[PDB]
Amino acid sequence: SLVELGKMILQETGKNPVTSYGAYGCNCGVLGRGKPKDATDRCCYVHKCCYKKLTDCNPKKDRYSYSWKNKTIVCGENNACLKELCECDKAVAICLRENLDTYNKKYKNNYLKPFCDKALPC
Amino acid sequence: SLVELGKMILQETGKNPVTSYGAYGCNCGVLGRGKPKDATDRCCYVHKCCYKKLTDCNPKKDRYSYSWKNKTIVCGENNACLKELCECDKAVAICLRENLDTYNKKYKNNYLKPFCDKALPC
Amino acid sequence: SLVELGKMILQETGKNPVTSYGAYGCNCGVLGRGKPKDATDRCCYVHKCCYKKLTDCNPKKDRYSYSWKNKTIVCGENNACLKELCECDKAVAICLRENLDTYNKKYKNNYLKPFCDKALPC
Amino acid sequence: SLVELGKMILQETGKNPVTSYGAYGCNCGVLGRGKPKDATDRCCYVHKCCYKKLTDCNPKKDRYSYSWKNKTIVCGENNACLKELCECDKAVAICLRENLDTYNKKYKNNYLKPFCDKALPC
Ligand SMILES: CCc1c(C(=O)C(N)=O)c2c(OCC(=O)O)cccc2n1Cc1ccccc1
Ligand SMILES: CCc1c(C(=O)C(N)=O)c2c(OCC(=O)O)cccc2n1Cc1ccccc1
Ligand SMILES: CCc1c(C(=O)C(N)=O)c2c(OCC(=O)O)cccc2n1Cc1ccccc1
Ligand SMILES: CCc1c(C(=O)C(N)=O)c2c(OCC(=O)O)cccc2n1Cc1ccccc1
C-alpha cells in the first residue's frame, strides 16, 4: 500500500514522500500518467506502468511485508501479486534516490500540472 | 545529541533505537560502561569510550548536522567536539547494523536484567 | 553566486576580483563572450561557456557551499547544477591564477571593447 | 610585523588569526612561552623560539615584504633579520594549517589564564 511505498522512499532517499514527491512533475504523487518532465518524473511513470499490470490485488491499499537488511529493501516472500507489488515500490524508491541529483524544485506542488502532455502507452 | 544518534541508528539498522537498543546488554542505552555481553553490546562499549574523550561539548544534548547521501551517513563540518561527536554516532550506527546477525533479545534489559561486570578502561 | 566566485578568485590569485577582473579583455566581468585577447581573457571565456551549460540553476545568483581545505577550494556536496556551478567557479579562479604572469593592465577597464571579435563557439 | 603574520595565517589556514589563535593554549597569541598543550600550541611555541633569535630587528613591529604566489608564501629578499623574521612567520602559518586536524577550541583561554608549565629552554 501507500504505507509501505512511503517507508521505502524515506528509507532509500531520506526524503518525506509527501513533501518531496507528493506532486512532482507529471507523474509523481498524482493520478494518471503524463510525459515525464525529468528523470525523477520518469521513475514515477514507470512505477505507474508497474502498477497497472497488477490485477488480483489492489496496489494502493493492500498491505504487504518487507524488511530493511544491509541497507537494502527485501520484499518478503508473498502472494504473486503482493510480491510483484512490493517489487514495484522497491524499484521506484531506488529510482528516486538515484535521481536526487537532478531533482528540480520548480517541478513540485503541481506547477507542471497544466502543462502535462498525454502519455505514451506503457 | 540523542536526537541525531537515534535517526542514524534508524537509517542504518532499520530499527527503532529505543525498542531495539534502549537497554541492551551492559552498554547499549544504559548509563556507564560494563564488560560487553556480545558484539552488539561491544558497539555501544566503543561508542561510550568515543563520548568519553569529548570534553568541549555535551554529547547527549548538543546538536549537530549530518546528511543521508547514497544510503551513507555524511557528517556535517563543525568544530572539533561536534564533528567528532557526529563521528562517534556514525560508527555506532554502522557497528550495530553490522552486528544485527547476532542481535539477541535475551540481552534486552526487559527480557533479562544482566549482571554487568566492571568495565576495563578505554 | 558572484559572492562565492569573488571569494574564490581572492583566495587563489590574491587579487580583488572587481578591481582586477571587473572588466578585463573581451570576456572577464563584461557581458557576452568574445575572441580572447590573452590567456587571462580565455579563462573567462571558458567560464562563460561553463555557465552556458547550466540551465537548472541560476549561476549568477544561486548560493552554494565550499570550503578552504589544504589550501584547496573544495566544493560542498549539492545537486548536479550547484556542484557544476561551484566547479565552474573553482576552475576560473584557478585558471586566472595560472595566467597572472601575462596579466596586462592595458586590457583592464574595458578598453578593448571596440577591439573585441566574435568568439569561436563553445 | 603582526600585520604580515596575520595575513599569512588567514591565507594558509583560512582562519581569522584573532578568533582562532588569539589566545590558544599556553603559547598562541599570548605573551611568553609555556609547555605546549597540543600540536597547534607547539607551532606557536616554536614560532616564539624563532623570534628569540631575531635581535637585530623587532619581530612584532617591523614590516617586511612577501607575496602570495601559487598559493605559497614567498618571502621577499631583505637583510638577515627581516628575511629570517618573514620565514619565522611563514613557518608558523604552515604549521598551524598542518595541525588543523587536531585544533580544538577547548584550549582557547577565553580570558581565563590556563595552567601553563615552564617551557623547555630555547
Ligand atoms: C512518488 C511517490 C508517490 C507515488 C509514486 O510512486 C508514483 N507517482 O508512481 C504515488 C502514487 O503512485 C501510484 C499510482 O499512481 O497509482 C499514488 C499516490 C501517491 C504517490 N506518491 C506519494 C506518496 C506515496 C506514499 C506515501 C506518501 C506519499
Ligand atoms: C544504542 C543506542 C543508545 C546509546 C548508545 O549508542 C550507547 N549505549 O553507546 C545511548 C547512550 O549512550 C551514550 C552515553 O552513554 O553517553 C545514552 C543514552 C541512550 C542511548 N541509546 C538509546 C537511544 C539513542 C538515541 C535516541 C533514542 C534512544
Ligand atoms: C573575471 C571575474 C568575473 C567574471 C568571470 O569569471 C567571467 N567573465 O567569466 C564575471 C562574470 O562572468 C559570469 C557571466 O558572464 O555570466 C559575470 C559578472 C562579473 C564577473 N566577474 C567579476 C567579479 C566576479 C565576482 C565578484 C566580483 C567581481
Ligand atoms: C597564533 C597567532 C599569533 C601569534 C603566534 O604565531 C605565536 N603565539 O607564536 C602571536 C604572537 O607571537 C609572537 C610573539 O609572542 O612574540 C604574538 C602576538 C599575537 C600572536 N598571534 C595572534 C595574531 C597574530 C597576528 C595577527 C593577529 C593575531
**Spatial contact of B28 and B108, defined as CB atoms under 8 Å apart:** no
**Spatial contact of D88 and D50, defined as CB atoms under 8 Å apart:** yes
| Long-range contacts at D9-14 (CB < 8 A, ≥ 24 apart) | D9/D92, D9/D93, D9/D96, D11/C14, D11/D68, D11/D71, D11/D73, D11/D93, D12/C71, D12/D73, D12/D93, D12/D94, D12/D96, D12/D97, D13/D93, D13/D96, D13/D97, D13/D100, D14/C67, D14/C68
- CB atoms B14 and A97 under 8 Å: no
State whether the beta carbon of B85 lies less than 6 angstroms from ligand 2.
no
Question: Which chains have 3 or more CB–CB distances shorter than 8 Å to chain B?
Answer: A, C, D
Q: How many CB atoms lie within 10 A of CB A95?
A: 19
**Spatial contact of B112 and B24, defined as CB atoms under 8 Å apart:** no
* Residue B32 in marked binding region: yes
**Spatial contact of D61 and D1, defined as CB atoms under 8 Å apart:** yes
**Spatial contact of C113 and C41, defined as CB atoms under 8 Å apart:** no
C67 touches chain B (CB under 8 A): yes
Say what the resolution is, in angstroms.
Answer: 1.8
For residues A96 and A92, give the distance between their C-alpha atoms in angstroms, rounded to a whole number: 6
Query: In angstroms, what is the span from residue B81 Cα to ligand 2's centroid?
Result: 18
A12: left (phi over 0), alpha (psi -120 to 50) or beta: alpha
**Which residue does chain B place closest to A97, by CA atoms?**
B70
D89 touches chain C (CB under 8 A): no
Measured in degrees and rounded to the nearest 5, phi and psi for residue D4 equal -70, -35
Instruction: Among the bound ligands, name the one nearest to the CA of residue C4.
Output: 3
Mutate to test the interface with C, among D71, D72, D99 (most CBs of C within 10 A): D71
Which whole-number Å values give the CA distances from D108 to D20, D29, D41, D103, in the listed order? 8, 10, 10, 10
C68 touches chain D (CB under 8 A): yes
Contacts of A70 in chain B (CB under 8 A): 97
For residues D17 and D10, give the distance between their C-alpha atoms in angstroms, rounded to a whole number: 6
* C39-52 vs C80-98: helix crossing angle, rounded to 10: 180
Contacts of C77 in chain B (CB under 8 A): 67, 69, 74
**Cell numbers given for D118:** 615552564
* Residue A18 in marked binding region: yes
Give SS3 for B76: coil
* Strands B66-69 vs B72-75: parallel, antiparallel or unpaired: antiparallel
* A2-13 vs A80-98: helix crossing angle, rounded to 10: 30
For residues D20 and D37, give the distance between their C-alpha atoms in angstroms, rounded to a whole number: 15
**Cell numbers given for B64:** 549537530
Q: A44-74: string of b/e by CB count within 10 Å (b at 16+)? A: bbbbbebbeebeebebeeeebebebeebebe
Query: In angstroms, what is the span from residue C2 Cα to ligand 3's centroid?
Result: 7
**Spatial contact of D57 and D46, defined as CB atoms under 8 Å apart:** no
Kindly state the helix (H) or strand (E) to which residue B73 belongs, with its residue range. Answer: strand B72-75
Place of cell 586590457: C107
Query: Which ligand 4 atom lies nearest to the CA of residue D7?
Result: 26
Side chain identity, residue B3:
V
**Spatial contact of C118 and C98, defined as CB atoms under 8 Å apart:** no
B72 touches chain C (CB under 8 A): no
**Spatial contact of D105 and B57, defined as CB atoms under 8 Å apart:** no
B81 touches chain D (CB under 8 A): yes
**Spatial contact of A37 and A111, defined as CB atoms under 8 Å apart:** no
- Report which DSSP code applies to B31: S
Query: In angstroms, what is the span from residue B22 Cα to ligand 2's centroid?
Result: 7
Query: In angstroms, what is the span from residue A31 Cα to ligand 1's centroid?
Result: 8
For residues D60 and D51, give the distance between their C-alpha atoms in angstroms, rounded to a whole number: 9
Q: Out of D12, D67, D71, whose CB is closest to C12?
A: D71
Instruction: Among the bound ligands, name the one nearest to the CA of residue B5.
Output: 2
C120: left (phi over 0), alpha (psi -120 to 50) or beta: beta
- CB atoms A69 and B14 under 8 Å: yes
- CB atoms D12 and C68 under 8 Å: no
Nearest to B78 by CA among B93, B67, B91, B92: B67
Which whole-number Å values give the CA distances from A2 to A89, A110, C29, in the listed order? 9, 20, 52
Contacts of C12 in chain D (CB under 8 A): 71
Nearest to C88 by CA among C46, C57, C122: C46
Contacts of B69 in chain C (CB under 8 A): 77
